[PDB]
Structures are given as structure tokens and as C-alpha cells.
Amino acid sequence: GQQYRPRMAFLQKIEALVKDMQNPETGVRMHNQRVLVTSVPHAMTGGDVLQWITQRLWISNLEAQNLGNFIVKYGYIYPLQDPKNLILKPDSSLYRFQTPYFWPTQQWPAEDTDYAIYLAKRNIKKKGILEEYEKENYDFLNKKINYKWDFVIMQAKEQYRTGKERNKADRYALDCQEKAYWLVHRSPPGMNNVLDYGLDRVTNPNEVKKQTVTAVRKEIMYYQQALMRSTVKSSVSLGGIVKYSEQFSSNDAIMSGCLPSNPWITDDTQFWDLNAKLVEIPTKMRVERWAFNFSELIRDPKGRQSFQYFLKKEFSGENLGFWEACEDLKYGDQSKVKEKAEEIYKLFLAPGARRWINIDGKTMDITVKGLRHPHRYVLDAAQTHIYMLMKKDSYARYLKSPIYKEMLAKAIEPQ
């Protein structure tokens, strides 16, 4: 199955923020401590942490509140009161920074042995001061790691013994700190497990894999291939992208709205009704969109139907049939391909063909040589040739034709 924990880039990013917060000159405002507590940092209010986030990242209080909540849910900061409530309260409620020893890590989850030791220790500090879920957890572990139990108990007794050399304030503070860790890593039932990362990976992200020769050879092949490829200036390609978005802006309903209205906003389905795939009379917006580029026309069944009528009138009404046949060959059922390829050649391309179309000498040779060993891309060169011919010649003339002009004229204008 899957053996490895996924990458967790967020951890380093929280840690960087937490370090910024602890800066002596520019960090979160801290509190005095009139009772001498040596084992943990000074406390700070939820409101002060939130204010620091809002100001540092220059964001709304809602966004700062969401982020602040996650810092608490992951256990980097913990509340001194109402400890089961893992939110950052925008008020005078007190919090402390967790010690780095109790931070979450990408590669290592909290371990059952360590949890058993914590519960066995807590068990000693009372009889069952253990909460319900913790008693269940303790009993589960006593069975699961039965073999380690002498070690678990020894270690619990050891730590309990050492805990007694702290004064009342330090002992209380340390107990709060450790409990805050376990609340994140072994959460009560019915509480979110923020540590749920979904599925493990097949591949270990922490593996420094030795590149084999075959690997480096393949890298070389990629570069040699890439160097053979042509590119254009950024001014050209990016100019195209900017122009494309500008051209399609009015058709982008999220940005610009639509006519008569957006069905998701008004519950009026007319916009969908008027734009049915096979609507009798298309909207003016739709007909106009066919003029943006050849693919817009071809991909719209109503557009393609109009374009086919134009072509048939010019005695080119098999080009589109040939293009569609090649599309089906390439994307359709593959048990058929060999026969299908041969029958398309015989029908459209061969001398005396019954749906004859013209292709140039070079394209025909590429096709004929390929057909010696038919496969699903064997008509790709002929298909491209015919598509580009339609695009370069027929498309612009279609847009200038009475057929397109009449379509524009009868097209529906809603609102």
C-alpha cells in the first residue's frame, strides 16, 4: 500500500511565524508574572496575538482569526483556561507558546509508548483523574503494548518522581503544557483531528535517492529534445494571453454577468434554455463568440452546423466529415482502429473515393506510408492538414458570408 507521510510545507511556515512572534523587539506583547514560574514562557492574551497577526501580515480580522485558530489547533500556542477549546479567542484569555519539543513534525507522529507513559503518570497523580476517553485510551494501550508495560510504568514513576522537585507553580505550568500537547496529538472523541493528512504516499519524500545512469541519460534526452523545440518571446505569448482574456471577458459570467440573469443567482433557467446545445435559434452572444476563433465555431454544434452549410455550398462539405471521421478514429473504440483507418482512406482519400477530398502530395505520402502499419494516429497528419486549411481559408470567408451574417441577424437578444 502506502508507507510514507506526505510533505507538510506548512510546518516550517508556522514555525517562522512563531519565531517572529517571540522576537524580543517586535514580537507579541507579553505579560508580567508576579508568581515566579521558571518552567514555561510568560503568558500573552489571545487579543494581543491576534493584533500582532493582523498588523504583521496586514490582513482582515477574519483572516487573522482563521490563521490564529490554526496555530492553536496545531498546538504551537495553547490556552491557559477552557483548554478543550482550541481556538484563539480575541480577548483577554491567556495563552503560552508551546516548547519546540512539543511541536508537530512532518516525519514523526507522536508515539503510543510516549502516550502510555503520559497516561500512566497522570494516573499516578490521582487515582483516576483520568477523563473518560483517557481511561479508554489507557486500557487500549495496556493491551496493545503489553510487552512494554514494565518500561512504561518505570518511566512514568521516574518522571512523576522528578516532577516533585518543582514548586507548585512550575508543576501546574508543566502539567498544562504537556496536556496541551496530548490534546492535539490524541484528541478527545468528537473533536477535529487537525493532524489528519489523508492517505500516505508510495514514495518517501524524505528519501535522498541516488540517481542511476539510466536516470541521467533520460534527463539528457529531455534536454536534447527540449533544445530542438522552438519558443517565442514572452511579449508575444503573454500578449496573446492578455488579449485572449480581454476577448472573452464579456462571456465570463462570473466577471460580467449574463442575460437575462445567472440561474444560480436568480433561479431563472432562461439563460440555460436559450443556450441549449441544440437550440433552434442561438443567442447573439453565442453567434458573436464563433467569430473569436475557429475552435469556438467548431466546438459549438450549432456553429459547426452553420459552418458545414457554408462548406457544402462551396462543394467542400466532406472536409468536416473527414475531420470528424479522424476524430472518432483517434478517440473512439480501439479494437476497430486498423479497419477504421483503412476504410476512412478508401472513403475520403483514395483515387475515385466516394467522399473524395484533396490533400497535398506530402500529406498523402505521410498517410500512405503510415497506413502500411495502421494505428490510431495514422490519419493525424491528414486531419491537421484539413483542419488548418479550413482555419486559414474557409473560416474568415465564412465570417464574411451571408450565411454568418443572416445568423447574426436572426440571433436572439435576451434581457
Binding site: 511565524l17 489528519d196 540517481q211 539528457i220 476577448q247
Partner: protein, 345 residues
């Protein structure tokens, strides 16, 4: 190993030569080209529909080309087809495995594909049968050696593209289940894919846990263009509507735009306040806006051209795991580990 050492030296030489050949034509930045594009109007999107019915995390969704039906899949093995406009559930099937991480709608609107922990991708027909038994009609198409992460129909109901934790993508014939082409190159688990909307229609892009996005030639099985600028896992990839660029979303909390014609990263969409992973990205119809779902339960919306955040959307109560803009560009759907989906407009 002298052969290995020499080959690595040659590979680095060619990497630097390719870098320099590409750099010669890098004369302008996208933010400069877009210096005078018109500003957007006020952002006002809100939740219009909440789809409740999944019993556990929603992992994937896809719109039907009819603009209103949606297929969605869950950790508990359940796949639901909704009429999202009314919210009515129209079809439902429980897969024999959990963690159905991938689902796709067929372009005919008469079938769906899905899979996950079963290491397969299976096609189910959709019918108007009264007591419809979908499970009885499951057809296993793809077989991988580890989990399915992503799938899509090609330009027909007859062919399917899959991505897997086994490190590969593959193209399949639905009727026979025959492997048409495998795509090897990712160093690790492949997490996502998207078919190019180009006029040629011979390529697709994938993203994975090698932190790379790779563009593949479906005819040859070769990676023709690779991009390696993310700092963590690439969770989502999506072509810009013209086909001449694509965006990715990553565990590194950024989304990025890559220009395929100039062969370069051209935008990084990020903020210091956004530190959790982007799981899913999709474009508005015109490509001006990029919507992304994040592991901190939010959706961030980006101005593709200007590079700034347009808005942050709150509402989901756990990770946003999946996000698609509707086929006619009027809405988008987010799915979440909170067991719900939302349609926004």
C-alpha cells in the same frame, strides 16, 4: 563511477544551455504586459447551494457538460450524481473500496468514471432505470499497481486518462480495458492531471510528489515540457482556456502560472497570510480569474493577469479538497472534508 559523473556533468551543461536559450526570449513580465488591463468590478460571490448527503470527506467532483449535474465521490466509497440546481440526487453507487479520490463525468453525460484505493478506474453508465443498479454495471477499465489519484475522459466516452500513486499516468480504451499508452517520468506519486484544450489535442499535463508538472505527448509517451519551481507537492493542474498556459496548486501554499509557448513560469500567486496547501485550482471561462481551494478550509481567488488576490471565501468547516468552475462559467463548486459541496456564484 566515472560514467555517472560525466553524464551528470553533461546533464547540468545542457540544463544551463536550455536555461540560456529560453532566457534570450524572456523580454517582459506578465505584470508589465497586463499593466493596463481593466480592473475587476466588486467581488460578490456567495454560496447558492449546499449539497449534503455524503457520509464522510468529499474528495473529488466534476461537472456534467449539461451545466447543472455534478458527480462527487467520498472517503466512504460512495459516489453521488446530483442535479445541483435543485439539489436532487439522481444516481448513487457505493464502490467496493474506500477513498474514492477520483471521479469524472463522461462528455455524453451518460457515464461516470471513478476509483481510488482499489488501484483501478471504473466506468459506470447512467440510466433512467427506476430501481437503478449501478454496482451491477461497473466496468473496470484502468489497473495500476497503487492508488488512483485522478482520472478524466478524453474527447469521447471511449477513452480515459488516469494518474496514480504508482508514479505513472496512463491512457486506456474503455471497451477493452487495454492500456493504450503509459507515461513514466514523475519521480513519485502522481496526484493530478488535465487534458489540453488545444486545437491539436495531443497533450495533457500532470503534477506530482516530485514537485514537478509535466506536459506529455499522448502519441509517444514522452514528456515534452517539464516545470520544477514548486517547493512541495503539486496537488492540482489546470490548463488556461486557450491551451497556451496552465496553472498549478501546491502544498507549498502557492499557485503558479506557466507559459507553454515561451516555456517559463510567469506568475506566482501567493500571500504571507496563506501558508497552507492549495488542493485544487480552476479558471473562470475567460481565464482572468483563478479559483483555488486550500487546506485551511478557505478559497482564494486570484487575478491571473495582475497577480493580486481578488478575494478570500470562508464557509467550509474542513479542507477544501476539490474545486471546478461550471462548464458555462456561471458558478463554481467546492468540495470539502466537511462532507459537503457548495455551489457559489
Amino acid at each position: 563511477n566515472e560514467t555517472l559523473a560525466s553524464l551528470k556533468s553533461e546533464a547540468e551543461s545542457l540544463k544551463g544551455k536550455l536555461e540560456e536559450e529560453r532566457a534570450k526570449l524572456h523580454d517582459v513580465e506578465l505584470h508589465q504586459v497586463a499593466e493596463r488591463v481593466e480592473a475587476l468590478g466588486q467581488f460578490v460571490m456567495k454560496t447558492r447551494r449546499t449539497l449534503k448527503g455524503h457520509g464522510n470527506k468529499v474528495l473529488c467532483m466534476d461537472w456534467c457538460k449539461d451545466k447543472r449535474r455534478i458527480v462527487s465521490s467520498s472517503q466512504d466509497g460512495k459516489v453521488i450524481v446530483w442535479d445541483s440546481f435543485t439539489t436532487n440526487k439522481e444516481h448513487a453507487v457505493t464502490m467496493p473500496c474506500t477513498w474514492v479520490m477520483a471521479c469524472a463525468y463522461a462528455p455524453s453525460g451518460c457515464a461516470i468514471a471513478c476509483g481510488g484505493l482499489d488501484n483501478k478506474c471504473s466506468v459506470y453508465p447512467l440510466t433512467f432505470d427506476k430501481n437503478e443498479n449501478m454496482a451491477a454495471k461497473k466496468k473496470s477499465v484502468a489497473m495500476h499497481t497503487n492508488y488512483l489519484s485522478a482520472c478524466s475522459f478524453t474527447n469521447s466516452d471511449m477513452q480515459i486518462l488516469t494518474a496514480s500513486g504508482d508514479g505513472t499516468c496512463a491512457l486506456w480504451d474503455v471497451e477493452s480495458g487495454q492500456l493504450l499508452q503509459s507515461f513514466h517520468g514523475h519521480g513519485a506519486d502522481v496526484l493530478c492531471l488535465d487534458l489540453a484544450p488545444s486545437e491539436t489535442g495531443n497533450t495533457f499535463v500532470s503534477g506530482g510528489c516530485d514537485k514537478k508538472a509535466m506536459v506529455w505527448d499522448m502519441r509517444s509517451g514522452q514528456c515534452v515540457q517539464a516545470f520544477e519551481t514548486h517547493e512541495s507537492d503539486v496537488n492540482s493542474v489546470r490548463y488556461y482556456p486557450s491551451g497556451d498556459a496552465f496553472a498549478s496548486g501546491s502544498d507549498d501554499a502557492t499557485c503558479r502560472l506557466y507559459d507553454l509557448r515561451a516555456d517559463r513560469e510567469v506568475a506566482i500567486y501567493s500571500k504571507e497570510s496563506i501558508i497552507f496547501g492549495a488542493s485544487s485550482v480552476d479558471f473562470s471561462l475567460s481565464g482572468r480569474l483563478l479559483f483555488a481551494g486550500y487546506n485551511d478550509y478557505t478559497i482564494n481567488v486570484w487575478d491571473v493577469l495582475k497577480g493580486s488576490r481578488v478575494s478570500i471565501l470562508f464557509g467550509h468547516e474542513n479542507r477544501v479538497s476539490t474545486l471546478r468552475v461550471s462548464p458555462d462559467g456561471t458558478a463554481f463548486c467546492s468540495g470539502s472534508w466537511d462532507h459537503t459541496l457548495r455551489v457559489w456564484a
